[PDB]
Amino acid sequence: MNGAIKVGAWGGNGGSAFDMGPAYRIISVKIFSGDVVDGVDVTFTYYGKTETRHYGGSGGTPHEIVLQEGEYLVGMAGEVANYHGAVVLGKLGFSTNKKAYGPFGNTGGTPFSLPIAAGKISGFFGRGGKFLDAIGVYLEPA
Amino acid sequence: AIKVGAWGGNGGSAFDMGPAYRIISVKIFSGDVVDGVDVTFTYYGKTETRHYGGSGGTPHEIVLQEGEYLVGMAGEVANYHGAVVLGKLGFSTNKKAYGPFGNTGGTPFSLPIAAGKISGFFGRGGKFLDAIGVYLEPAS
Ligand SMILES: [Br-]
Asked: What domain range includes position B19?
């Protein structure tokens, strides 16, 4: 609605649905991972207030992407894995117009990939519980 | 303004449909792999058919009914006789999922569209369908 374009989610159907909606500015993403992707922090701005939302569980090591001036998110990729009986993100990475980051996570399964030939990622939705069950993205022009 | 993909190889020649006003139908030509696609659509007052890739294999036509639109695309990227191509391709509408068309496995990709629709195509083609990507638009 209101003109949104949402692609995904990739992953399983467990955990609880989340939807950040679209941001004015994503500032940074932290991807928490070990054997699989445990969760994500998204830090974003709105009217000069910086806020952080966490989705998924409390495990894993953090892997950060701090967006530089003129840097924006142009790809996402990973693997959907079966882990301990749950269908979750086993690996997750992102590309910007400047650099690739990751993927983070150590469990393979069914790959997915989202090259954005025109446009950028503008927000996130998905499912989280003990791990990051699923992830999807909002898109807008670049 | 919103283009995702293409998934597939670097061979063949580039194509680019741009976005349509309305997609009427898509035909997927396949045998062992995806040979190519026809897209029939409305565009700036005209009704047009374009063909991308080769024309071998068998055509499989999906005609979109009133209130029906394309909300997913998926497939596998395969090596076929030395060409990195779509080995399998399928589409979902808001009513039903179709496919796969083609028989050759390789690396899967999937594009579920939770909000919006596919409005057109771009990619690369030769004898077969080397690569395919989509233009995306919001729902109306
Ligand atoms: Br349409």
From this structure: 1-140
